[PDB]
Amino acid sequence: TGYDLSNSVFSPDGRNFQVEYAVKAVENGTTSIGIKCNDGVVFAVEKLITSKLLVPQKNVKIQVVDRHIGCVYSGLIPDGRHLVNRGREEAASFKKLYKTPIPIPAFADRLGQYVQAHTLYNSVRPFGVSTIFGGVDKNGAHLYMLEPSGSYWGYKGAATGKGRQSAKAELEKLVDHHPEGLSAREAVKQAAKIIYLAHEDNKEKDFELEISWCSLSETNGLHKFVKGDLLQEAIDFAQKEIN
């Protein structure tokens, strides 16, 4: 054997074990979710409060790309930042040449190809993050989820991290119960509930909630963070559901 010691080496199964090992790092990370809605998307993430000494609200994990795309990830946080930095460069050059802001499926492939490239050689390590991202373009709203292998698909709902199975189950209920669609303001509230429900899989340390959203009507197609009254309203909605 020894097929798992080097990246880009096929095993006798036809598998790249190094990429599968990177997935383990993602499974170890905190929970993050994405919810596709009527005219946009909503993102939410779990921030573990390691200590009282952490400044609340000041360790921001969700990242914006361009002015219309949001990205959140689970696993190795630095690897996620590297991927967003590339995402920003890809979006910049697209807008430079083609004038229009990068469409979400176009953006999805730019990341996909870049992550896939890091499975082709033994001189690089695969990415240790699953990235949930999306936004609003000319064709409407799109939500995507990208994995260490470079694999990505479009999603109605997406989840990754330590509480992915709990979150996936909760997402599947929303899709079934709302076939016509979910509203942006509803999706924010639901996102809070699902993070609080997914926190049961990480309940030693208490946590801080962080939400963002892109919506054609609510945010005018741009990515914004949910703060203040709208955030506290979403927290209260979630607190009421766990009890």
């Binding site: 010691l5 080097s6 033994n122 001189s123």
Partner: protein, 244 residues
């Protein structure tokens, strides 16, 4: 990374030997024997082709003996493909010298540069060495007739008579026995053939399994001629010395 698969071709053993050079010499010891003998009035180059097939085209063939310029030739022992890389480099090097100085390149200078190339592959670059040993036969107006040999290590030495390839130990003993300094070309021709005939792994030495070449001053007045022997000419010289 790729460290895992690196053979490290250019390192020393604990005994202070270069593994790859030693193994390349082991490769060469299985190649057809080539002999060079230097006489007072010329040089002989004799070489045994590697186990021939009856359907091999013999007359339009070149395996062992190569021309470097009008005054220098080489006998090869090892990988032919490797030898041709080095031969074309040597051919070019000769022309660079002629272009620069308007004089044919001195034999040793050509030999040194070709040997320096081989040396480089043993010290840096991480590539395998060339699996080739040469016998250089040539003439220039400083030292006259000269025989050299070079091997994968990049080390070269001069000789009166020398063999490379298979059975060099037995061949060198026979040459050391019958060689003398006042020898003529025609005598050296006979020694070269007689030596191959006894050291060969074949049943009997025939015209079709040999390559032969002389470098005489047997042209007209003070000039050197290279003769690469044709098949029929090897057949005749083999009868003339009574081997067949």
């Amino acid at each position: 990374g790729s460290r895992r698969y690196d053979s490290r071709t250019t390192i020393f053993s604990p005994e202070g030997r270069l593994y790859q050079v030693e193994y390349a010499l082991e490769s060469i010891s299985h190649a057809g024997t080539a002999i060079g003998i230097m006489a007072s009035d010329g040089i002989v180059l004799a070489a045994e082709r590697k186990v021939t097939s009856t359907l091999l085209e013999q007359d339009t063939s070149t395996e062992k003996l190569y021309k470097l310029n009008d005054k220098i030739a080489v006998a090869v022992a090892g990988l032919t493909a490797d030898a041709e890389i080095l031969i074309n480099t040597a051919r070019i090097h000769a022309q660079n010298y002629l272009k620069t100085y308007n004089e044919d390149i001195p034999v040793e200078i050509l030999v040194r540069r070709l040997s320096d190339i081989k040396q480089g592959y043993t010290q840096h670059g991480g590539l395998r060495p060339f699996g080739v040993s040469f016998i250089y036969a040539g003439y220039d107006d400083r030292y006259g007739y000269q025989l050299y040999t070079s091997n994968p290590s990049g080390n070269y030495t001069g000789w009166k008579a020398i063999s490379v390839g298979a059975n060099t130990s037995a061949a060198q003993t026979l040459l050391q026995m019958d060689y003398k300094d006042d020898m003529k070309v025609d005598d050296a021709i006979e020694l070269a053939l007689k030596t191959l005939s006894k050291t060969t792994d074949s049943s009997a030495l025939t015209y079709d399994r040999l390559e032969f070449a002389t470098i005489r001053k047997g042209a007209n007045d003070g000039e050197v001629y290279q003769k690469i022997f044709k098949p029929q000419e090897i057949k005749d010289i083999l009868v003339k010395t009574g081997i067949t």
